[PDB]
Amino acid sequence: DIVMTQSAFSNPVTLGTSASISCRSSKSLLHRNGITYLYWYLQKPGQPPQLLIYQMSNLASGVPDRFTSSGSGTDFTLKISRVEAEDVGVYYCAQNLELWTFGGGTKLEIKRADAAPTVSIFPPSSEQLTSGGASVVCFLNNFYPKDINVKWKIDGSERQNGVLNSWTDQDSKDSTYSMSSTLTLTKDEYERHNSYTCEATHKTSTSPIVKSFNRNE
Amino acid sequence: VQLQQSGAELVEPGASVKLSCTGSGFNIKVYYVHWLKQLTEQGLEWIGRIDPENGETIYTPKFQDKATLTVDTSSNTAYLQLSSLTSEDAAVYYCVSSGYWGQGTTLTVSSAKTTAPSVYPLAPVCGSSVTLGCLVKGYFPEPVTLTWNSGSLSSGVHTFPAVLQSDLYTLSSSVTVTSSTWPSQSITCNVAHPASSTKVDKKIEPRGPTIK
Numbered sequence: 001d002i003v004m005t006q007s008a009f010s011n012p013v014t015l016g017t018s019a020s021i022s023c024r025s026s027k028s029l030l031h032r033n034g035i036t037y038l039y040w041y042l043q044k045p046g047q048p049p050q051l052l053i054y055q056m057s058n059l060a061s062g063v064p065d066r067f068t069s070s071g072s073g074t075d076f077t078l079k080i081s082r083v084e085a086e087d088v089g090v091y092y093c094a095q096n097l098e099l100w101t102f103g104g105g106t107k108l109e110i111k112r113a114d115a116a117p118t119v120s121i122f123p124p125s126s127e128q129l130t131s132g133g134a135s136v137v138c139f140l141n142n143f144y145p146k147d148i149n150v151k152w153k154i155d156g157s158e159r160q161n162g163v164l165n166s167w168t169d170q171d172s173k174d175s176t177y178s179m180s181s182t183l184t185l186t187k188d189e190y191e192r193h194n195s196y197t198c199e200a201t202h203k204t205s206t207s208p209i210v211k212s213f214n215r216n217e
Numbered sequence: 218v219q220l221q222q223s224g225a226e227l228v229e230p231g232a233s234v235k236l237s238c239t240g241s242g243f244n245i246k247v248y249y250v251h252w253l254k255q256l257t258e259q260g261l262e263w264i265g266r267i268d269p270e271n272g273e274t275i276y277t278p279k280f281q282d283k284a285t286l287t288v289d290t291s292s293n294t295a296y297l298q299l300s301s302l303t304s305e306d307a308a309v310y311y312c313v314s315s316g317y318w319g320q321g322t323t324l325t326v327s328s329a330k331t332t333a334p335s336v337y338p339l340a341p342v343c344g345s346s347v348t349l350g351c352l353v354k355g356y357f358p359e360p361v362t363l364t365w366n367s368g369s370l371s372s373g374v375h376t377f378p379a380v381l382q383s384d385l386y387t388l389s390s391s392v393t394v395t396s397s398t399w400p401s402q403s404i405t406c407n408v409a410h411p412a413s414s415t416k417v418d419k420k421i422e423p424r425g426p427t428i429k
Contacts, residue, residue, distance in 0.1 A: 001278075046360075048311055048318035049261065092261060099277065100251065100263040120348040120391070123424075125337040128352075135352060137339055139391045141375060164387065166377040173372075180377040180389045182352070213342045 002027050002095050006103035012111040015175060019080040021106045023093035028073040029056075037097040040069055040078050043105070044089040045169045052091075053078070083110060088170045112175040116204040117143035121197075121211040124190065134190030136183045138198035138211060142176040145203065150181040153197040153212075159183065190215070218242040220312055220319035224411030227325045227358045228302055236322050238295040238312030245269050245288060250295040251313040252286065255321070264310075267295060302326045325358035329384045332357040333413035336406065338421045339389075348393045349421045351406035355385045356413070364407045365392045400427060 003026040013019040029036045038056040041049035051060040056069050056076070066081045078091060090105040117140040124134040140148055146167065152159045162185060168178045181198060197212040221239040228234045238250065252264040265276035267286040274286045283306075285298040295312055309321040332355060339350025353361055363376050373393035379386040392404065399421070406419040 048321060051316065094261075099275065102261040102263070104260040118346075118348070118393075120350075121342055122339040122350055123342065125339065125352070128335070128337050128354075131335065133354075135337070135354065137350060137352060137389060139348060139350065139375070139389075141348065141391060141393070164380050164382065166380055166389070168375050168377055171375075178375040178377070178391070180375075180391070182387065182389065217343065 002029075002098045002101055004093050004095055004101050004103035006091075006093055006106050008104055008106060010106050010108065012109040013080075013083045014111045015085065016082050019083050019108065021078040021080075021091050021093075021108070023071075023076045023078070023103050025074050025076075025095055027098070029076075029095050029097050030073040031097060036071075036073065037095050038069060038071070038076055039094040039096065040067070041092045041094060041102075042087075042089050043092065044172070049092060080108075083108070085110065085175050086172050088172055088175070109170060110175040112144050114204050115142060115144040115176055117141055117148065117179075117200050117202055117209060119198070119200050119209045119211045121213055123196070123213055123215070124187075129187050129190075132187045134185045134187050136185070136190075136196050136198075138181045138183075138200075139178065140181065140200045140202075140209075141178040142171070142174060143178070143202055143204070144176050146170075146177045147203070148177075148179055149201040150179070151199040151201065151208070152181070152183050153195070153199065154193045155195050156197075218317055220314060220317050222310075222312060222319035222322045224320070224360055224362070224409075225323050225325065225358055227327060227329075227331055227412055229328045230302055230304065230326050232302055233298060233300050234302060234324060236297040236299070236310055236312075236324070238297070238314075238319055240293045240314075243314065243317060245293055245295050245314060246290060248315040250286070250288060252284070252297045253311045253313065255309045255311065257308070264297070269295070299324075323358070323360050327358065329357055331412050332385060333415040334361060334386075334408060334410050334417070336408045336417040336419045338406065338419050339391075340421050340424045343424045345396055346393050347396045347399055348391050349399065349404055350389060350391045351408070351419065351421075352387070352389050353379075353408055354387045356387075356410050357385055358412050359386060360411070361386070361388055362409045362411075363388070363390045365390070366403070366405055367407055370394075370404065 199208040334356035337352040376390040379388040
C-alpha cells in the first residue's frame with residue numbers, strides 16, 4: 001500500500017500572501033511512464049471534495065492558476081501563489097498509483113484585519129413559548145480573530161448553565177468567524193425574570209459589546 | 218449529471234445498512250463506482266470500487282469483510298452494504314463515478330429515535346442593517362439543510378454547526394439584510410430534515426405589527 005502523510009497543522013496565512021502545504025508518500029508516486037500520480041482536492045464544509053490538480057502538474061478545468069504542485073517523487077508541496085478568501089477549507093493530497101489513498105488533510109486558515117463582532121439579541125419565539133420552552137439567542141457575527149467570550153446575565157446576575165455556543169467555519173467571502181450563543185430555559189423560568197443580556201468580550205476592545213432586552217417590554 | 222445519495226441513514230448498532238448511489242443523468246454501466254468514508258473532522262478513506270461490467274470488487278484490506286459492494290444496472294444503482302455496525306462506522310459515505318461525487322450519506326449508528334425538528338423564527342427585538350434568525354431545535358439524527366428564500370438569499374448568511382445534547386441536535390442560522398428590505402420583502406427559513414422527511418418553510422414575522 002501507499003500511505004499519504006500531511007500534517008493537519010499549518011499556521012494561519014495572511015490574505016493575499018503565498019502558502020505552501022506539504023505531503024509525503026510512503027513509496028514513490030513516479031511511474032515508469034514518467035507520470036507522477038499525485039492529486040490535490042479542496043473540501044469546503046458540507047460539500048464533497050473538489051479536484052484541484054491531477055497527476056501533479058495539471059490543473060482541473062476552471063481551477064485558478066494560483067495552485068501548482070511539484071516534488072521529489074516522495075515529498076511534495078501544493079503552492080498557493082496568493083491566498084484568497086474563497087480558498088479556505090481542507091486540502092487533501094491523494095495518490096492513485098496503488099489503489100486510492102488520501103492524506104489526513106490540512107485546513108487553510110486566513111489571517112485578516114481584526115474585526116469587532118456585530119451583536120444581535122433574540123427573545124424566544126411565540127411558537128417556542130406556546131410549547132413551554134424559552135431559548136434566548138445571541139449572534140456574535142463577522143469578527144476576527146476566532147477567540148471570543150460570551151457572558152449571559154439574567155436580572156444582572158451571571159448565568160452559566162443552559163448555554164450552548166457554536167462557531168461557524170471561516171467565512172469564504174470576508175475571512176471572519178461568527179458565533180451563536182443560546183441560553184435555554186423553561187417558559188416558567190423565563191417568565192420569572194425580566195432583563196436578558198449577552199456580553200461579547202473580544203480582543204478588539206477592553207469593554208464588552210452589550211446587547212439586552214426586558215421581557216416586559 | 219448527479220449521483221443520488223440519501224442525506225441520512227440511522228441504524229442501530231450491530232445491525233446492517235445498505236447505502237444506495239443512484240445515477241441521475243448518469244448511467245452506471247462502464248465507469249468504476251468508488252466508495253469513500255469520511256469520519257468527523259478527519260480524512261477520507263477509500264473503501265473500495267466495483268466494476269459494473271462483471272461485478273468485480275477490490276477493497277482496502279481493512280474493509281474486506283465489513284463492506285460489500287454491489288451494482289444493479291437495471292435500477293441504475295450502486296450499493297454499499299456494511300455489516301455489524303459499531304460507533305466507528307458512523308461517518309459520511311460518498312460514492313464516486315467518472316469523477317462525479319455524490320452529496321454523501323451521513324450514517325448515524327444509534328438506537329435513539331428519529332425526531333423531526335422544531336423550527337423557530339427569530340425576529341429582531343421590539344442601524345442600516347438587520348439580522349434575522351432561525352432556530353432549529355430538537356431533531357435527530359443529523360443532518361438538517363437550511364436555506365433562506367429557497368436559496369435566493371445566500372449573501373450575509375451564517376449557519377452554525379449543530380450541537381448534540383441529551384439525544385437531540387440544535388442548530389441556528391442568521392441572515393443579515395438592508396433595514397429597508399425587511400419586513401417589506403418576505404424572508405423565509407427553509408429547513409429540511411431528510412431522516413424524518415420534514416420540510417418546513419418558516420416565514421419571519423415582525424414581533425410587533427407594522428401598524429404600531
